[PDB]
């Protein structure tokens, strides 16, 4: 959407239509300083748990990383605002 | 298409009404091509009384006029008002259909209500067309959106971070970081930031990318708004600021290097605050950084970004990701101490990669080695990482003295 | 455009099961605990609920050593032991939350009465050192 | 009752007119306070008290060349 959020960018552009890869290495026991957590001398009809972002949990957002600007493997498209209503703190 | 006849199994049934026990199949074929031949000769001669006596209906008095024509005896009882009823009999293996005729008391036909008397044939004249079209006599056929307050706030805050002056930018970032009610404007800010980082590919502006990364860093410091629902948009924008190769307009003089370590610190914060075992944010970020680093053909800028993010994640990550590929430093020093082309742009990026690598691997060498470190540099690759490790041990001793 | 209202990845029979197992594993009645512990020890479908169990354990010990509530801790350590011997579920994705919880049971000071339950405290350190090795 | 059968659940919906009025009111008040403090900090400012910019900043009054155009004309139509 040309007139939506990011209209400023669209106007500036002037477009007007409208073995180290082994799974264990990445397990967070081998990548997290969990020692810091140890506490020493410290001093359901509706969901009980919260619902996670399905796009973060499931989608391949990694496909929106632009590795090479000139050699971009696919063609990206303008993104429309989707106003997810799962999030609270949004009136609608 | 083909000559259609009565079925041959319909003549075995008829032959058992007669009393003939066994009739062979060549006799049944001999019967059914004759009786279906005589049906077609009375089907087509009944049609000659349907056409010459103009009827287009083929009443049962047409067949009786044709059986009279072929000399065969008439079929009695087919002029009464009847229809086609059939009654199925299932049985214990014998499937058939019959009539199921009914009875009626004789005095209820003597005392039936008589139908009305018929009328005699008379003539009637009427105009069908009068010099043209037909007359109309009855003997003829008939013929979600932001309120203006927050729209103005969104406009002023986004245009304050495009680069007219620095003081309005600092007040806009201190607004974003410290306001309580900026929800309902978080999706607009996420869209603005992600599309603005995308617009770097058309115009390789380092400055506007630094401004958008300071916008993300200000969005993270807000205590009131929760970026959990919108982090899937801000993660690849910061990732694009890390591992893309042309971050500059003039590659040689622009310090894309700082937008590298700033965005690497940003993504370490974004996967410290938000990584949950349902999310798998940190493991999926380490996997992208790792397969971008281990894979050859990658430019020195994107390798710098990969090493910078991996080294800002923490100590155990550089233990189990960076330290196996320390021999890659030799492949780097292949193109530094001895390059056929010196005046290219690979040398500044290579020794930037080298400086970052030995700066981050000096405390890792200080953690997992002896305290002496006499010829660890010689044992290390190129003998320089080891000098940096000795310097790091000296710095740690100085920090202990300060404590 | 509004994105569709998402559903939690647990069923309401699974979410009710999680609520019953966690309210039985806080040890109000001993037979309830023991079944819930055997249910944790041999439910084949207890994967895809395991993040919520690991988070309930981890979060519990850390706000349960603020006041040294020994039973709350002895029940959670038995829940950890019942989570470990289940053969179906894949645990080493969640062990980064499990291990600092047990280290805290073994290496921590006791905010409640120092003597008397120290006998159990030794067992709290006995059960924790067993599951640690 | 959980081995073999599954039905989905949803998040708790807040359809209450009182808390929706409170949420919309407080969000409008907070965004207009943030907007006016940002515009008073990045421009010329006045003050009811001596040297008072942090608490109650006023956007300074600027004269218009044609004031009836900004007074009488409607902005939302």
Describe this structure as you would to a colleague.
With 92 residues, chain A is largely without helices or strands. In chain A, 12% of the residues lie in helices and 0% in strands. Chain A is built from two helices and no strands. The radius of gyration of chain A is 21 Å and the shape is extended. Chain B has a domain at 8-70: Histone, subunit A (Orthogonal Bundle). Chain B is built from 17 helices and two strands. Chain B has a two-stranded antiparallel ribbon. In chain B, strand 1 and strand 2 (96-98) form a beta hairpin. Helix content of chain D is 40%, strand content 5%. Chain D contains two helices and two strands. Chain D has helices at residues 17-41, 67-72; strands spanning 45-46, 58-59. Chain D is elongated. Chain D starts with 16 loop residues before the first helix and ends in a 5-residue tail after the last helix. Chains in contact: A-B, A-C, A-D, B-C, B-D, C-D. The interface between A and B is large, with 47 and 65 residues. Chain A: It comes from Homo sapiens (Human). Chain A: This is Transcription initiation factor TFIID subunit 1. Chain A: It is found in: Nucleus.
Largest sheet of chain B: 2 strands, antiparallel
CATH topology of one domain in chain B: Histone, subunit A
How many extended strands of chain B? 2
Task: Give me the strand/helix succession of chain A.
Answer: HH
Fraction of residues in β-strands of chain A: under 5%
Count of alpha/pi helices of chain B: 17
Structural class of chain A: little secondary structure
**What is the subunit organization of this protein?**
part of a larger assembly
Main beta-sheet strand count, sense and barrel state of chain A: none
CATH top level class name of one domain in chain B: Mainly Alpha
Name the features.
part of a larger assembly, 4 chains, A: 92 residues, little secondary structure, extended, D: 77 residues, mainly alpha, two-stranded antiparallel ribbon, 2 strands, 5% strand, transcription, core promoter
